[PDB]
């Protein structure tokens, strides 16, 4: 069935807002967050980070209707963004991008408060 419930539509719209956000110079900040590297590729991340998370995990939960509200999705984004900000240095760009997208997430939730 092609038609989404109101909640599915809202979930989808929040996700898409973070995925498609582009800054004033045309860069999609989400590109690096789509998929986390392997355990072999980033051993250090997996030793430090308790709950690994990337946007494909959030997308998979979403497409399996595993999020029953918007708060549950925000929780996983915040986890992802906090992980990036824990592992990477405060002066690094992935740290900074995670913060801008955190703002976009929240700004997108506020925009859609009525809907
Ligand atoms: O902290 C993260 C770091 C990386 C990452 C991606 C490509 C790289 O070349 C890298 O050095 C780190 O991907 C991620 C994807 C999702 C969530 C993350 O916190 C991360």
From Swiss-Prot:
Bromo domain segment(s): 2-112
Tissue: Widely expressed.
Outcome recorded upon mutating residue 23 to E: Found in a case of clear cell renal carcinoma; somatic mutation
Cross-link for Glycyl lysine isopeptide (Lys-Gly) (interchain with G-Cter in SUMO2), residue positions: 2
Phosphoserine sites (modified residues): 38
Cellular location(s): Nucleus
Annotated disease: Renal cell carcinoma: Renal cell carcinoma is a heterogeneous group of sporadic or hereditary carcinoma derived from cells of the proximal renal tubular epithelium. It is subclassified into clear cell renal carcinoma (non-papillary carcinoma), papillary renal cell carcinoma, chromophobe renal cell carcinoma, collecting duct carcinoma with medullary carcinoma of the kidney, and unclassified renal cell carcinoma. Clear cell renal cell carcinoma is the most common subtype.
Quaternary structure and partners: Component of the SWI/SNF-B (PBAF) chromatin remodeling complex, at least composed of SMARCA4/BRG1, SMARCB1/BAF47/SNF5, ACTL6A/BAF53A or ACTL6B/BAF53B, SMARCE1/BAF57, SMARCD1/BAF60A, SMARCD2/BAF60B, perhaps SMARCD3/BAF60C, SMARCC1/BAF155, SMARCC2/BAF170, PBRM1/BAF180, ARID2/BAF200 and actin. Interacts with PHF10/BAF45A. Interacts with acetylated 'Lys-14' of histone H3 (H3K14ac), and may also interact with other acetylated or methylated Lys residues on histone H3.
Annotated function: Involved in transcriptional activation and repression of select genes by chromatin remodeling (alteration of DNA-nucleosome topology). Required for the stability of the SWI/SNF chromatin remodeling complex SWI/SNF-B (PBAF). Acts as a negative regulator of cell proliferation.
Protein name per Swiss-Prot or TrEMBL: Protein polybromo-1
Parent sequence residues shown: 652 to 766 of 1689
């Amino acid at each position: 069935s092609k038609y989404m419930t109101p909640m599915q539509q809202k979930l989808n719209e929040v996700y898409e807002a973070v995925k498609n956000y582009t800054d004033k110079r045309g860069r999609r900040l989400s590109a690096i967050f789509l998929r986390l590297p392997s355990r072999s590729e980033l051993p250090d991340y997996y030793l430090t980070i308790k709950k690994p998370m990337d946007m494909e995990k959030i997308r998979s939960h979403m497409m399996a209707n595993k999020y029953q509200d918007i708060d549950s999705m925000v929780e996983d984004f915040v986890m992802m963004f906090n992980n990036a900000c824990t592992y990477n240095e405060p002066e690094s760009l992935i740290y900074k991008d995670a913060l801008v997208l955190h703002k976009v997430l929240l700004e997108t939730r506020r925009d859609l408060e009525g809907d």
